[PDB]
Design an enzyme around this catalytic site. Structure first.
Site, mmCIF file in Angstrom:
data_model
loop_
_atom_site.group_PDB
_atom_site.id
_atom_site.type_symbol
_atom_site.label_atom_id
_atom_site.label_comp_id
_atom_site.label_asym_id
_atom_site.label_seq_id
_atom_site.Cartn_x
_atom_site.Cartn_y
_atom_site.Cartn_z
ATOM 1 N N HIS A 1 2.719 30.251 10.074
ATOM 2 C CA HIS A 1 3.023 30.997 11.295
ATOM 3 C C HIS A 1 1.793 31.159 12.183
ATOM 4 O O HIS A 1 1.926 31.467 13.373
ATOM 5 C CB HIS A 1 3.607 32.369 10.958
ATOM 6 C CG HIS A 1 2.575 33.401 10.632
ATOM 7 N ND1 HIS A 1 2.267 33.757 9.338
ATOM 8 C CD2 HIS A 1 1.779 34.152 11.429
ATOM 9 C CE1 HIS A 1 1.321 34.678 9.353
ATOM 10 N NE2 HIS A 1 1.006 34.935 10.610
ATOM 11 N N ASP B 1 5.290 29.970 3.876
ATOM 12 C CA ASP B 1 4.377 30.154 5.006
ATOM 13 C C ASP B 1 3.050 29.480 4.669
ATOM 14 O O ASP B 1 2.058 30.121 4.312
ATOM 15 C CB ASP B 1 4.192 31.636 5.321
ATOM 16 C CG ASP B 1 3.538 31.872 6.679
ATOM 17 O OD1 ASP B 1 3.291 30.882 7.409
ATOM 18 O OD2 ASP B 1 3.278 33.049 7.019
ATOM 19 N N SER C 1 -3.955 36.573 8.434
ATOM 20 C CA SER C 1 -3.070 35.500 7.989
ATOM 21 C C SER C 1 -3.834 34.189 7.832
ATOM 22 O O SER C 1 -4.703 33.847 8.646
ATOM 23 C CB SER C 1 -1.922 35.287 8.983
ATOM 24 O OG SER C 1 -1.029 36.394 9.078
#
Ligand code: NA
EC number: 3.4.21.5
Lengths: 250, 27
Positions: free
Chosen positions: A43, A99, A198
């Protein structure tokens, strides 16, 4: 990273920063797994609901850095991206399942005291280390609090959490490609990843061979360091097949 | 490869400030 501290210099030599090129901004963390391959969260590259669909030409990476801002002469290295590979079964419409993403650098980076790759886990290592209560380590330049930006890389140790606790902590449908980590409210310590972390690595140091292994990728959470919530990490070993496939094909 | 072994710590026989927390969790 919330409730962490400053990394020592050279503590996490596989740490990579991922920037948008134009306008330049730190988007995410990432990790170095060889001189030419970098791991990150999917993402970070592709997230349509937020108008994110970066390709090779939109991004660059920085390797070997300690301070977020100040330039580190002869230490940090910059690289462009030759190729981006998203997992084809990455599910951004539901729950960020799988992810994960791979980026192949235009030019191999030279290792140094500050630039060095992390191991990916084999089966035995993953079975031995991904155990509830066992602690791993999370690193990033992300936010220090829930919406603020650190000057130097932040680091925090966090225990892996039993899968039922993870399931009951959120109404988002979790999958076996995820694990969660963090302290329970009872344990009286704190710590979490946060927005911006992330793609950073969840690593563990193996007592069998003293090598560091990346078990996870910072993927998602609801708030940062909230009581009863936990951060969620892409299960690296579960997708290792895919990783090897990609690297061997290209 | 040579992975997971840090120049400034494992290769210099030096313990990072908090890795012992991880080791002691592994019990
Ligand atoms: Na929490």
């Amino acid at each position: 990273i919330v409730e962490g501290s400053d990394a020592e210099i050279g503590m996490s030599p596989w740490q990579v920063m991922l920037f948008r090129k134009s306008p330049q901004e730190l988007l995410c963390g990432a990790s170095l797994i060889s001189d030419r391959w970098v791991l990150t969260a999917a993402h970070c590259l592709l997230y349509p609901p937020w108008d994110k669909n970066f390709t090779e030409n939109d991004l660059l990476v920085r390797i070997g850095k300690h301070s977020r801002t100040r330039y580190e002469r002869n230490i940090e290295k910059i690289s462009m991206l030759e190729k981006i590979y998203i997992h084809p079964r990455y599910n951004w419409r539901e729950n960020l399942d799988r992810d994960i993403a791979l980026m192949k650098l235009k030019k191999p980076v030279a290792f140094s005291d500050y630039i060095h790759p992390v191991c990916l886990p084999d089966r035995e290592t993953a079975a031995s280390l991904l155990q509830a209560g066992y602690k791993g380590r999370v690193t990033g330049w992300g936010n220090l609090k829930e919406t603020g930006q650190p000057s130097v890389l932040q680091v925090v140790n966090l225990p892996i959490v039993e899968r039922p606790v993870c399931k009951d902590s959120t109404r988002i449908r979790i999958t076996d490609n995820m694990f969660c980590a963090g302290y329970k409210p009872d344990e009286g310590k704190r710590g979490d990843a946060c927005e911006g972390d992330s793609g950073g690595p969840f690593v563990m140091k193996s007592p069998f061979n003293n090598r560091w292994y990346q078990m996870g990728i910072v993927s998602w959470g609801e708030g940062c360091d909230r009581d009863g919530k936990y951060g969620f990490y892409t299960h690296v070993f579960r997708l290792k097949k895919w990783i090897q496939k990609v690297i061997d094909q290209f | 490869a040579d992975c997971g072994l840090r120049p400034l710590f494992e290769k210099k026989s030096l313990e990072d400030k908090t890795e012992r927390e991880l080791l002691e969790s592994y019990i």
